[PDB]
Every structure is written in structure tokens, then in C-alpha cells.
Amino acid sequence: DIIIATKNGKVRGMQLTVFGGTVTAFLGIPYAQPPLGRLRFKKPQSLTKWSDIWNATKYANSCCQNIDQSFPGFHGSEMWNPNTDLSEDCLYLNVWIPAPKPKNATVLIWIYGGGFQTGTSSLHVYDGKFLARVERVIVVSMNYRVGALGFLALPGNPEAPGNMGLFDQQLALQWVQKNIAAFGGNPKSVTLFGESAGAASVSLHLLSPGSHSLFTRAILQSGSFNAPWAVTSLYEARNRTLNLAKLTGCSRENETEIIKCLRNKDPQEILLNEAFVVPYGTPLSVNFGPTVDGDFLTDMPDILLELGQFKKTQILVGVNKDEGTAFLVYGAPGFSKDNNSIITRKEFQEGLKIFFPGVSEFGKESILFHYTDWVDDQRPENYREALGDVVGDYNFICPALEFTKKFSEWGNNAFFYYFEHRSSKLPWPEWMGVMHGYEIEFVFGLPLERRDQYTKAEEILSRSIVKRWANFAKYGNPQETQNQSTSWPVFKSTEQKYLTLNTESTRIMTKLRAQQCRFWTSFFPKV
Amino acid sequence: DIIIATKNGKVRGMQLTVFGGTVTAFLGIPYAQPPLGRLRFKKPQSLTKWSDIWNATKYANSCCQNIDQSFPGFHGSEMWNPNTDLSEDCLYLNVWIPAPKPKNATVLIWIYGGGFQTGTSSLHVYDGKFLARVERVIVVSMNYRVGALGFLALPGNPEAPGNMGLFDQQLALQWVQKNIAAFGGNPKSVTLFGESAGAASVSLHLLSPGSHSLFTRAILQSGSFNAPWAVTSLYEARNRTLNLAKLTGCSRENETEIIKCLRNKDPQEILLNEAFVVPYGTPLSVNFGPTVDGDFLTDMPDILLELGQFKKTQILVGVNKDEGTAFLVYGAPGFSKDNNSIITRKEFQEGLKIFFPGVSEFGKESILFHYTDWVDDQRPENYREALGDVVGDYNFICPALEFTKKFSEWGNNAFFYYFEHRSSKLPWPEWMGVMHGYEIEFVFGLPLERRDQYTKAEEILSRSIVKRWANFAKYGNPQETQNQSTSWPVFKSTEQKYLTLNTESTRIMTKLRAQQCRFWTSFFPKV
Ligand SMILES: *[C@@H]1O[C@H](CO[C@H]2O[C@@H](C)[C@@H](O)[C@@H](O)[C@@H]2O)[C@@H](O[C@@H]2O[C@H](CO)[C@@H](O)[C@H](O)[C@H]2NC(C)=O)[C@H](O)[C@H]1NC(C)=O
Ligand SMILES: *[C@@H]1O[C@H](CO[C@H]2O[C@@H](C)[C@@H](O)[C@@H](O)[C@@H]2O)[C@@H](O[C@@H]2O[C@H](CO)[C@@H](O)[C@H](O)[C@H]2NC(C)=O)[C@H](O)[C@H]1NC(C)=O
Ligand SMILES: *[C@H]1O[C@H](CO[C@H]2O[C@@H](C)[C@@H](O)[C@@H](O)[C@@H]2O)[C@@H](O[C@@H]2O[C@H](CO)[C@@H](O)[C@H](O)[C@H]2NC(C)=O)[C@H](O)[C@H]1NC(C)=O
Ligand SMILES: *[C@H]1O[C@H](CO[C@H]2O[C@@H](C)[C@@H](O)[C@@H](O)[C@@H]2O)[C@@H](O[C@@H]2O[C@H](CO)[C@@H](O)[C@H](O)[C@H]2NC(C)=O)[C@H](O)[C@H]1NC(C)=O
Ligand SMILES: *[C@@H]1O[C@H](CO)[C@@H](O)[C@H](O)[C@H]1NC(C)=O
Ligand SMILES: *[C@@H]1O[C@H](CO)[C@@H](O)[C@H](O)[C@H]1NC(C)=O
Ligand SMILES: *[C@@H]1O[C@H](CO)[C@@H](O)[C@H](O)[C@H]1NC(C)=O
Ligand SMILES: *[C@@H]1O[C@H](CO)[C@@H](O)[C@H](O)[C@H]1NC(C)=O
Ligand SMILES: *[C@@H]1O[C@H](CO)[C@@H](O)[C@H](O)[C@H]1NC(C)=O
Ligand SMILES: *[C@@H]1O[C@H](CO)[C@@H](O)[C@H](O)[C@H]1NC(C)=O
Ligand SMILES: *[C@@H]1O[C@H](CO)[C@@H](O)[C@H](O)[C@H]1NC(C)=O
Ligand SMILES: *[C@@H]1O[C@H](CO)[C@@H](O)[C@H](O)[C@H]1NC(C)=O
Ligand SMILES: [Cl-]
Ligand SMILES: [Cl-]
Ligand SMILES: [Cl-]
Ligand SMILES: [Cl-]
Ligand SMILES: [K+]
Ligand code: NA
Ligand code: NA
């Protein structure tokens, strides 16, 4: 029986057997008042205290969200859907600690992605018990509000100020600062890690002055806030909140009255209307996301980044080889997960209209010009591959590389990786390659479980990544020092060294996607 | 009708149509007295002059040599066998010039490989008409004596001084210095290029004071004189000449008498006994090769290299990804070109005894230790691949990299490549990969001929390599400047940048085979 006294009252955890050892899991500890009734769309309010023992022995409710129903019955998409009940009452977090209880362990805090519209901390691929067992770190993860309920903004109105889900994340970081030592953790050694919108969130904690003293360092897997889907302008945010009011019968002349009417709607009516607040969207649309609220975020984040106004610390950033392919089967014409998706030039063109809907004809022709000068045979897959690369370079890889360059120019060590291993169990088809999201299970150590039929080469790859990530959290340096491994060099402007992650051989390379990123970074923003 | 006046008399060439243009070929011009009767085993004597017109309209005799009969009827091995009559009368060279005749063209002089035991300039894959047509350079190639007839040595005795075939090469370089301007060539812009023993030969011309004023720069494809098969010690050379005498009935007390008796033997009796002058050999045995003769080579070449005593100029050096695989089917047990050659550990061990016959048990165990610590699954091909890498790293790649490091430390620009494209027409099986010898046809531009069924991607690769090699010869810098190509950086000690050559994407990488070469270069020589 493991019972821990926190600042809000006692919590009871449970013992898990993991690889011949034990891990103690405390699943579903509350970290804020449930944001119901009058609290809907406000910043999270802090917890009052319980007398008695809170049983943290099962995952809590996931936050309200739309679900992906594009492939019912299919593991490749269903594994990202929420696996506990959906509820507005969803502000909880999970703690995994080594047994015996550690003395001052480094803490890894995971922030899930999902476009800021979806996601939950309870998915199988985010289970922190392997990292706790193998590296003797404490792993923490939280649920945070998503969609309009997390990110609706009428900027400057404290009834719906924006960024509520980022404030939920921040309050969970505060919870670790105040309580993690009772679990054996060191509040002075806390690394954030997250993937896609979870990575963009981590990068915004580097910018937010209220997060500055709540963590030590940061890991960004496939995402950063300069990615084109990550931050909503003030103008589109007010537009979208007003469209949402229109669609739900809540248009009013007084803005505080709009919010009060939105607070009377059942969650389902809000969720049903979210897709439509925008005149056209894409597979990557973030309808309700982070905004410049003058609170969490004090200025446009591209200005803060450019002028060095962010926490000075080490970062670990990287991307997967085929980031853009997952998105093509959610609307590009000619694509299917159930065939080889060979498309024509005309299809490629229609595909750019799907992913770049507000963009000029010239802008879309510029994309086609840059990506279709082929090397070289008339390969059938030319256009299929070009579209996946357009979408992955624009939305993920070039923005991660630009973020890492700009961050590292202010004097801190940064380490960049390119993940290029396709999981032997991947249920999506071969043409999609090394997809977005599919490094996560290697990071959390799932291939360390021999019972699961990953290959031996994947066990070794995951074991090495897990060690590099734990060394980065503990020591700021993501080396694997014992097994004659390739040394991971810092990423600097000028040389731009990165490390490739694969089952065969790790290589130091330079200037990832140089010619493509010059296009997206220096030309495309003009268009 | 094209007739050119040389210093020895007139020669008549022939016109070839190549890609909608014309090339003039002068095949089979003599450059020395035929080395017959009393001249057998002596240095080549210079030509006397003919009155009348020498018809250089067909390839000349190849020098006497044993032939590869291991796979009769098989193109993969037969393409390297000689395709003109074998004769002691074989000191001729070929000249290809652009039409119309150029004004002061750069000259590329090809030196074929063949272990110093075999080879000829007339093979299809060395046909210089494509380079002359496309890059408007003059290409020259020579036959040089091989085997005992080229390299027998009784060191210091001018009846058989050693290095005769290197002196044949040198006299052909002298011939170009004196005559190439009559063909439109520039004698001040002459680049040597060669592969395997042809590359080792080129590297020895960099060391030989009599070659210094005969060329400008050098290209070394898969070979250098520090490779373990390239130079015979004085002691094994005298041993081998004496064994040859024993086997032919020519043992005498007076050494000049041994030579005179060897001069009475028919060539065939000499060729038949060459395999046996050594108590055991390997697939890579060079029984009669370059020696330290105090003439061509004034000291041990490792000393000259180490102390900077060589021509100061630019070099282009490189190797193929699977250099060692071709040799495994000429005697390693379990290997066959007609199956996947999966071998066991015991086979791997027997295989080291085949390739390292004079080496201690400890030495052979050290090889096995270094190459069999696997990453990682129990892959069936582990031992098959390890053997190909042992043989290719020891015999070709580590010595090319060490040569390039040591050369470049004295201040000259060097450029290193790693060739990693397997020809779509390769008649050897897939497990042999990117074999030794199979970059040659890309260098000479054979895939530029669309009629030959190489792929389009191979046409473009060859076109780019041909341009880099011609730019290196003409300008000392192997760039392809017009097609947004990767820039080829100089190879320096410290960084050791090299350029990968492939059909997909060219990359700049660093420290090729670092861990393996430390083994072969700093440890193995001790054993
Ligand atoms: C690969 O599939 C796509 C997707 O559409 C299909 O899914 C298939 C596996 C099959 O069940 C099919 O019936 C289903 O419609 C094909 O594109 C579709 O092609 C149809 C029929 O020609 C068009 O009229 C559709 O609009 C188009 N759908 C979409 C979303 O674009 C595609 O041609 C096929 N590609 C192959 C076989 O290479
Ligand atoms: C691949 O072939 C080798 C080579 O030997 C063979 O060539 C084959 C394609 C076939 O025609 C065969 O009859 C011929 O002998 C095999 O190694 C040989 O195996 C034999 C029979 O067991 C041994 O007794 C031989 O000594 C050995 N030869 C040599 C040179 O080592 C090899 O086993 C086979 N490998 C496979 C199928 O994976
Ligand atoms: C935000 O403001 C308007 C909102 O118009 C919308 O009405 C909402 C309630 C919702 O249903 C939404 O889908 C609908 O679009 C946008 O006006 C649109 O602009 C288009 C032309 O692109 C016109 O056709 C309409 O006025 C309207 N669209 C449709 C499909 O009827 C406006 O575009 C937007 N502001 C932005 C994008 O900055
Ligand atoms: C060079 O000198 C002798 C030469 O011995 C050889 O006689 C030749 C005419 C020829 O047929 C050759 O194959 C034969 O080996 C070498 O002596 C050998 O050493 C071995 C032991 O390894 C003994 O068994 C024999 O004396 C002889 N070999 C055989 C197979 O009979 C000597 O090794 C060599 N010098 C070197 C390698 O430096
Ligand atoms: C907490 O845990 C134990 C179950 O072992 C139980 O005695 C106690 O009542 C629990 N509290 C609940 C279910 O509310
Ligand atoms: C944990 O280590 C920190 C430094 O990282 C130190 O300041 C703190 O007091 C430690 N607490 C322990 C060992 O209980
Ligand atoms: C609008 O209504 C709110 C809600 O009661 C009220 O408090 C506020 O003072 C009013 N504001 C304006 C600008 O009219
Ligand atoms: C290092 O190698 C050992 C055994 O050689 C292995 O069991 C372990 O998984 C490796 N450790 C890491 C951190 O990769
Ligand atoms: C050289 O060439 C021509 C063939 O066109 C001929 O007239 C001449 O006799 C030739 N010399 C020979 C064959 O020796
Ligand atoms: C060829 O160029 C060289 C320099 O490389 C020059 O010295 C020589 O005289 C030239 N001859 C010509 C153009 O005929
Ligand atoms: C050996 O014979 C040669 C050949 O005629 C002769 O010229 C030479 O002087 C003799 N040399 C010795 C060392 O006896
Ligand atoms: C450069 O590109 C052109 C056409 O775009 C092509 O035809 C030519 O083969 C290329 N040249 C080289 C030297 O690679
Ligand atoms: Cl078009
Ligand atoms: Cl670079
Ligand atoms: Cl053993
Ligand atoms: Cl390096
Ligand atoms: K050793
Ligand atoms: Na479902
Ligand atoms: Na034959």
C-alpha cells in the first residue's frame, strides 16, 4: 500500500510489475477545480484540499473533444482516440515513480499533441511506467482542455481570455513544483517533452514568463509554435468565436452575454459546430488554438523568438522522415491507406488546393515549381511523394529547423534529430513511410517489452533513445556514453549538424532539407 | 581522312560517330620498341621512327597474361578478360580526340588495373570516345607489361631490375608530353586516372621523380600504393624470381645467367609457373608487382608519403561501397555467385584463413572480434556481409582514406568520394552490392548511350560524374556548377568530408569507416 501526502491531501497509488521490478503509478490525481458551469472557458482555478485518501488507481476522464471516425475498426487511427470517458471534468494528471521510491529523481512531464483539438494523457503509447522502471526517472502527464473549451478567445475578456488549455498545462507544472518532492522527485530538474501540438505547447512554455521557473529544459518532437498551424491571430480568433455564437444561437450585442449563452449550451452543441467556424479547413486545421492573449503570451511569438525573449536553457528538437503522409488520406484526392495512392499531376494540383486553401494561384504554382523538378526517371510515385513532402516540410520540418536555429543563436546548446525508422508493427501502408507520431512509442520504451513482437533491432533502438532522452533530462546532454555510440553534436547556426535515428547506423549529417526550407522560410511567407 | 605527324612518323586515325557528332580515334600507336628476345624483362627502349603512315585503326595486342577461367560464358567475369590477341609485342597506346580537332585540350591518361598481373586498354568499359565527345577532352590509354614479364625483379640487376611495367606507363606519359600537341592536346594539362592496380600505379607516379614533370594531376579509383597488395618487398621479390627459376629449370649460380635462361623460355612456361612462386596465395595475390628498385621508386613508399616526398598537386580519390564482395567467390568457402551465400561462423573463420594466410591465430581472432559484434537481430547474412567488409576495408577503403589523409596534410586539395550505386545491368547477384570495378563504366560515360538500357537516373548520374571528372582534370576542382548540385568540399585531416555518389541524393558525410579503419591502420599492422 503506497500512500503519499500532497499539499492538497493524501493520494493512494498502485504497484505495477514492469520487467522484473516494480513501478508505483498514481493515475488521475486532480490538479484544478473541475471547470464546469460558471468556470467553463475561464482559466483553471486552484484546488481546495480533500480530507481523506484520493484513490489514484485509474486513468481519469479525457477532456471533451471530437473523435476521428474516418477509419472505424482500424488500429492505425483508433489508437489515437481517447480511451477513457469524455467529460468537461478532466483536469487530472498521472505520476509514475520507480520503486523503491527515489531520492531526488529527475522529472519528465509529457504534453500530448492532437492539433489542440483532441488528445489525452491515458493513451497506451504515452504510458510512463517503462521510463520510470528503466531510467529511474519520475514521469508526469496531464489532461488539458482542447477545442473551443480549451482555446475559445474574446481577447482581453476574462470570461473567455484564450489559452485556457495552456494555463491548464501551466497549473499542472505548478502542481509538480509544489508536490513532486513528496514523491521523491527533484522540482529543480524537470524536463518538458511533447509531440506535435504538445511540442508546440512546450515551445510556448519557453516563451511564457509564468512558466519560466516551472521547468529546467525542453524536448520538442515534431512541432514548435512557429509552425503555420500553431498560433491563431487575434483577428481570426474573434472571427471564429463569433461564428461559433452564430451557429449556436448565441449571437448577442454584449460580448459577456455571448459567453454566458455559450456557457448554457451542452458540450455536444459546441463540439458539433467547431468544424464550421472557418469557411474552409484542411486536414491540419487548428480552429481553436493558442493566441496572443497578453497573459500567457505577451507578444507575437515570432517577435519574442527573433529578439531572444525566451528561457535560456538546452533544447532537444527533431522530426520524422515522412511527417506529411498521415494527413494525405484525410482528404487529398486519389490517396487511400488501402492502395499505393499513385496520383497524377492534376491530383497533385487538387491536393495543393486542399492543403493551401486561402493561398493565391501564384502561391500554389510556386509550390509545384519547387517540388516537381524530378531526379529523374518517370517514376509513377513522383507526385505522391512530392505531396507528402510539401505537407511535412511546410507544417513540421522547416518550422522545427528554423525554431532550433533561432533559439541556438542566443547562445544555448540545442540538439536536433531526424527519426527515420518505420516500426515493424505499423498498421498503415508502406507508402506512408516513417509517419508523424510513430517515434513516440520508441521514446516511451514500448519496444523494450519483448512480449510485444517488435524486432530485436527495435528493442536496441528504443533502449538507446530512452537513454539519450533521460541523459538529456538529467544532464542536458543527450549522449549514450557506454556503447561506442555516435556522439550527438550541438546544432549551431552555420554548421547545422543533426543526428539520424535508425536501427542500422546513426549518422551525423548537416543542413537537413536545406533547399526546401529556403523555399518555405524565405520565400513562401511573402506569397 | 585524318593523318597526324608525330615525332616518330605519321599516323592515320579513324572517324567514329558518337551522339550525333564525330570523334577521331587512333587505336594501337606504338610507343616503345617491342620488348622481345634480349629486351624481355628490361626497361622499354624508345622508338626509332617509321617512314610511311602507321595505320592506327584497330586495338593492338594485349600483353601476355593469365586469364580468368573461373566462370566461362559469364559476362560478369569475361568482360575483364582481354579482347585482343595476347603477345609480348604489346607496347601500344590509344588516343581519342574531339572533331573538329581541339585547340589546346586537357588530356586524361587512363591506367587499367588487374592486380599488376592482368588487364588491357582495349576493354569496352575503358572506351574513351564518350569522354572525348561529351567533354571535349583528349583521352589516352596504354598497354603496359604485367606479371613476371612486367615486374620480375632481381633488384639492382639491369637484366631484370623490376618495375618494367611502371616504366612502360612512364614512357607512354613521355610520348604524350612530346606528341600530344600535334593532336590538339595541352601537355601542360594532363591528368592520370586509373582503377585498382591502375590507381596504385597513378599513386606511384606521384612518388616517382622521373614522372614528376609528365602530368599535372591525379585521380585514384579504388586503389593506392599503401594498399597491402600493391608493393612487394625486396626479400619476397628475390624469393619469387628464384622460385620461378626453380620451377622452369632455370636455377643457375650466376644471376645474369638465370635471366638469360628465363629469356629462352616460351612465354607460356613463364605464365604457367607464376601462380606457384608463392607457398599460398589468396584471391588478391599480386605475385609480381612494384618493388623498391632505387630507380622508379627511390625508397619505401610509406616513408616518402609520411615525410611529404611526392608531387604537390590536387588529387581525387574514392572507393565503392562493396569493394570486397567480388573476391569472395574466388575461394572463400560457402560463397557462390549463384546463391545467396549465407555462411556460418565456421565458414567466416575458414574465409579469414583464405584471405590472411600468413597471419597469426591472434591476428585472425582480432579480425573476427572487430567485425562480429552485431547490431543486432540474428540476421542470417551477418557473417556473409562481415567477410565482404573485412576484405574491402583492409585491401581498398582504409588504405585509400589513409593515403588521402597523409597526402592532404602536406597542403594540397584532395577530394574523396564514396560510390554507392549498383548498376541496373550488373550480371553478378544482389548480395554482392556495389562491387569493385563497377564505377568505371559511369566514369567513361557508357550510360550516356540511351541505346544500352541503363535507366534514366543512371544516364544523369554518369553525366554528372563525367562533368566532375573533366572539371577536376581541367580546373583542379570536381564541381558540377550548373545544375544546383551539391558542392564537393575538400577532404582535410580533422574533418574528413567526402561526397557520396548515387542516383538518389548526393550527400556530404564525414569520417568514412572511422571505427574500422582505426583497427586496420593502427592496430592490424602490429599483428
Ligand atoms: C486508391 O483509392 C482511391 C480512394 O477511393 C477508393 O478506395 C479504394 C481502395 C476503393 O475502395 C474505391 O472504390 C474507393 O472509392 C481511389 O480514388 C477514388 O477513385 C474513384 C473511382 O475512380 C474516384 O471517382 C474517387 O473520387 C476517388 N476517391 C478519392 C477520395 O479521391 C484511387 O483511384 C485508388 N488508387 C489506385 C488504385 O491507385
Ligand atoms: C551456395 O553454393 C555453394 C557453392 O557450391 C555449389 O554451387 C551451387 C550453386 C551448387 O551448384 C552446388 O552443387 C555447388 O557445389 C555451396 O557450398 C558448397 O556446398 C557443398 C555441398 O554441401 C560443399 O560440400 C562444398 O564444399 C561447398 N563449396 C564451396 C566452394 O564452399 C553453398 O552451400 C550454397 N549455399 C547456399 C545454398 O546457401
Ligand atoms: C469569418 O467570418 C465569416 C463567417 O462566415 C461564416 O458564417 C459562419 C457562421 C460559418 O458557418 C462559416 O462556415 C461561414 O463561412 C467568413 O465569411 C465567409 O466568406 C465567404 C467567401 O470566402 C462567403 O462565401 C461567406 O460570407 C462566408 N462563407 C460561406 C462558406 O458561406 C469570413 O471568411 C471569415 N474570416 C476569415 C476567414 O478571416
Ligand atoms: C619462398 O621460398 C620458399 C620456396 O618454396 C617453394 O618452392 C618453389 C619453387 C614453389 O614451388 C613454392 O610453391 C614452394 O613453396 C618457401 O618455402 C616454403 O615454405 C613451406 C612452409 O610454409 C615449406 O612447406 C616449403 O619449404 C615451401 N612450401 C611448400 C608448399 O612446399 C618460402 O616460404 C618462401 N618465402 C617467403 C614466403 O617469404
Ligand atoms: C480507496 O481504496 C480502497 C480499495 O482498496 C477502499 O477501502 C476505499 O474505500 C477507496 N475509496 C473509494 C472507493 O472511494
Ligand atoms: C535535489 O538536488 C538539488 C539540485 O538539483 C538540491 O538543491 C536539493 O536540495 C536536492 N534534494 C534532496 C537530495 O533531497
Ligand atoms: C454587458 O453585460 C455584462 C454581464 O452582466 C455586464 O457586467 C457589463 O457591465 C455589460 N458591458 C457592456 C460593455 O455593456
Ligand atoms: C549497452 O549494451 C549492453 C550489452 O552489450 C545492452 O544490454 C544495453 O541494452 C545497452 N545500453 C544502452 C543504454 O543502449
Ligand atoms: C593504311 O591504310 C589504307 C587503307 O584505307 C591503305 O591504303 C594502306 O595500305 C594501309 N597500310 C597497310 C594495310 O599496311
Ligand atoms: C596551352 O595552354 C598553356 C597553359 O595551360 C600555354 O602555355 C600553351 O602555350 C597553350 N598552347 C596553345 C593555345 O596552342
Ligand atoms: C656472370 O655472367 C655474366 C653473363 O655473361 C657476366 O657478364 C658476369 O660478368 C658474371 N658475373 C659474376 C658476378 O660472376
Ligand atoms: C544539367 O541539366 C540539363 C537540363 O536541365 C541536362 O540536360 C544536363 O544533362 C545536365 N548537365 C550536367 C553536366 O549534369
Ligand atoms: Cl499545368
Ligand atoms: Cl555542409
Ligand atoms: Cl569460436
Ligand atoms: Cl564528424
Ligand atoms: K587489439
Ligand atoms: Na470508434
Ligand atoms: Na573465355
Side-chain angles (χ1 to χ4, degrees), chain B residues 135 460 463-464 467 480 482-483:
Chain B
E135 293 293 333
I460 299 304
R463 180 74 202 82
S464 170
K467 170 67 70 187
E480 192 296 306
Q482 306 177 295
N483 286 356

PDB file of all heavy atoms in Angstrom, chain B residues 135 460 463-464 467 480 482-483, ligand 12:
ATOM      1  N   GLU B 135      32.875  15.872 -73.289  1.00  0.00           N
ATOM      2  CA  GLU B 135      33.632  16.885 -72.526  1.00  0.00           C
ATOM      3  C   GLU B 135      34.737  17.579 -73.343  1.00  0.00           C
ATOM      4  O   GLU B 135      35.411  18.507 -72.844  1.00  0.00           O
ATOM      5  CB  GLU B 135      34.228  16.283 -71.227  1.00  0.00           C
ATOM      6  CG  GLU B 135      33.104  15.895 -70.240  1.00  0.00           C
ATOM      7  CD  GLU B 135      32.343  17.072 -69.686  1.00  0.00           C
ATOM      8  OE1 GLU B 135      32.907  18.187 -69.609  1.00  0.00           O
ATOM      9  OE2 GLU B 135      31.147  16.929 -69.327  1.00  0.00           O
ATOM     10  N   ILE B 460      21.735  10.319 -65.964  1.00  0.00           N
ATOM     11  CA  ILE B 460      22.003  11.588 -65.250  1.00  0.00           C
ATOM     12  C   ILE B 460      23.231  11.470 -64.263  1.00  0.00           C
ATOM     13  O   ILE B 460      24.109  12.338 -64.141  1.00  0.00           O
ATOM     14  CB  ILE B 460      20.646  12.024 -64.431  1.00  0.00           C
ATOM     15  CG1 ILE B 460      19.422  12.262 -65.337  1.00  0.00           C
ATOM     16  CG2 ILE B 460      20.879  13.232 -63.506  1.00  0.00           C
ATOM     17  CD1 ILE B 460      19.652  13.327 -66.466  1.00  0.00           C
ATOM     18  N   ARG B 463      26.343  11.360 -66.395  1.00  0.00           N
ATOM     19  CA  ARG B 463      26.603  12.666 -66.954  1.00  0.00           C
ATOM     20  C   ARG B 463      27.231  13.582 -65.860  1.00  0.00           C
ATOM     21  O   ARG B 463      28.149  14.350 -66.139  1.00  0.00           O
ATOM     22  CB  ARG B 463      25.258  13.311 -67.448  1.00  0.00           C
ATOM     23  CG  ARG B 463      25.447  14.718 -68.072  1.00  0.00           C
ATOM     24  CD  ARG B 463      26.076  14.667 -69.461  1.00  0.00           C
ATOM     25  NE  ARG B 463      26.761  15.928 -69.913  1.00  0.00           N
ATOM     26  CZ  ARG B 463      28.007  16.326 -69.592  1.00  0.00           C
ATOM     27  NH1 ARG B 463      28.824  15.650 -68.680  1.00  0.00           N
ATOM     28  NH2 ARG B 463      28.461  17.438 -70.188  1.00  0.00           N
ATOM     29  N   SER B 464      26.684  13.543 -64.645  1.00  0.00           N
ATOM     30  CA  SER B 464      27.245  14.390 -63.575  1.00  0.00           C
ATOM     31  C   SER B 464      28.717  13.966 -63.176  1.00  0.00           C
ATOM     32  O   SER B 464      29.597  14.827 -62.931  1.00  0.00           O
ATOM     33  CB  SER B 464      26.281  14.374 -62.361  1.00  0.00           C
ATOM     34  OG  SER B 464      26.922  14.977 -61.266  1.00  0.00           O
ATOM     35  N   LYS B 467      31.115  15.086 -65.921  1.00  0.00           N
ATOM     36  CA  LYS B 467      31.416  16.503 -65.760  1.00  0.00           C
ATOM     37  C   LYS B 467      32.382  16.788 -64.559  1.00  0.00           C
ATOM     38  O   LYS B 467      33.374  17.579 -64.655  1.00  0.00           O
ATOM     39  CB  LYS B 467      30.083  17.336 -65.678  1.00  0.00           C
ATOM     40  CG  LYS B 467      30.304  18.846 -65.259  1.00  0.00           C
ATOM     41  CD  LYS B 467      31.119  19.639 -66.444  1.00  0.00           C
ATOM     42  CE  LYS B 467      30.285  19.869 -67.769  1.00  0.00           C
ATOM     43  NZ  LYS B 467      31.254  20.455 -68.839  1.00  0.00           N
ATOM     44  N   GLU B 480      30.157  20.232 -60.162  1.00  0.00           N
ATOM     45  CA  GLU B 480      29.196  20.310 -61.271  1.00  0.00           C
ATOM     46  C   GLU B 480      28.458  21.640 -61.081  1.00  0.00           C
ATOM     47  O   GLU B 480      27.632  21.729 -60.185  1.00  0.00           O
ATOM     48  CB  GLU B 480      28.286  19.048 -61.380  1.00  0.00           C
ATOM     49  CG  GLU B 480      27.480  18.972 -62.722  1.00  0.00           C
ATOM     50  CD  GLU B 480      26.482  20.153 -62.837  1.00  0.00           C
ATOM     51  OE1 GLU B 480      25.683  20.316 -61.908  1.00  0.00           O
ATOM     52  OE2 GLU B 480      26.510  20.960 -63.806  1.00  0.00           O
ATOM     53  N   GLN B 482      26.417  23.841 -62.817  1.00  0.00           N
ATOM     54  CA  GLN B 482      25.247  24.413 -63.492  1.00  0.00           C
ATOM     55  C   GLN B 482      23.928  23.867 -62.978  1.00  0.00           C
ATOM     56  O   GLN B 482      22.940  24.477 -63.187  1.00  0.00           O
ATOM     57  CB  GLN B 482      25.342  24.162 -65.023  1.00  0.00           C
ATOM     58  CG  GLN B 482      26.641  24.668 -65.581  1.00  0.00           C
ATOM     59  CD  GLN B 482      26.829  24.401 -67.062  1.00  0.00           C
ATOM     60  OE1 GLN B 482      26.936  23.217 -67.533  1.00  0.00           O
ATOM     61  NE2 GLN B 482      26.925  25.507 -67.824  1.00  0.00           N
ATOM     62  N   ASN B 483      23.906  22.718 -62.317  1.00  0.00           N
ATOM     63  CA  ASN B 483      22.632  22.085 -62.048  1.00  0.00           C
ATOM     64  C   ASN B 483      22.188  22.016 -60.562  1.00  0.00           C
ATOM     65  O   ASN B 483      21.679  20.999 -60.113  1.00  0.00           O
ATOM     66  CB  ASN B 483      22.588  20.704 -62.756  1.00  0.00           C
ATOM     67  CG  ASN B 483      22.407  20.819 -64.297  1.00  0.00           C
ATOM     68  OD1 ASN B 483      22.238  21.899 -64.834  1.00  0.00           O
ATOM     69  ND2 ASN B 483      22.461  19.695 -64.998  1.00  0.00           N
TER      70      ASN B 483
HETATM   71  C1  LIG C  12      22.269  19.760 -66.439  1.00  0.00           C
HETATM   72  O1  LIG C  12      20.843  19.796 -66.717  1.00  0.00           O
HETATM   73  C2  LIG C  12      20.407  19.766 -68.087  1.00  0.00           C
HETATM   74  C3  LIG C  12      18.913  20.133 -68.320  1.00  0.00           C
HETATM   75  O2  LIG C  12      18.183  20.625 -67.194  1.00  0.00           O
HETATM   76  C4  LIG C  12      20.771  18.358 -68.605  1.00  0.00           C
HETATM   77  O3  LIG C  12      20.251  18.102 -69.924  1.00  0.00           O
HETATM   78  C5  LIG C  12      22.303  18.078 -68.440  1.00  0.00           C
HETATM   79  O4  LIG C  12      22.465  16.671 -68.598  1.00  0.00           O
HETATM   80  C6  LIG C  12      22.895  18.474 -67.046  1.00  0.00           C
HETATM   81  N1  LIG C  12      24.346  18.622 -67.089  1.00  0.00           N
HETATM   82  C7  LIG C  12      25.213  18.011 -66.270  1.00  0.00           C
HETATM   83  C8  LIG C  12      26.643  18.392 -66.554  1.00  0.00           C
HETATM   84  O5  LIG C  12      24.948  17.200 -65.347  1.00  0.00           O
END
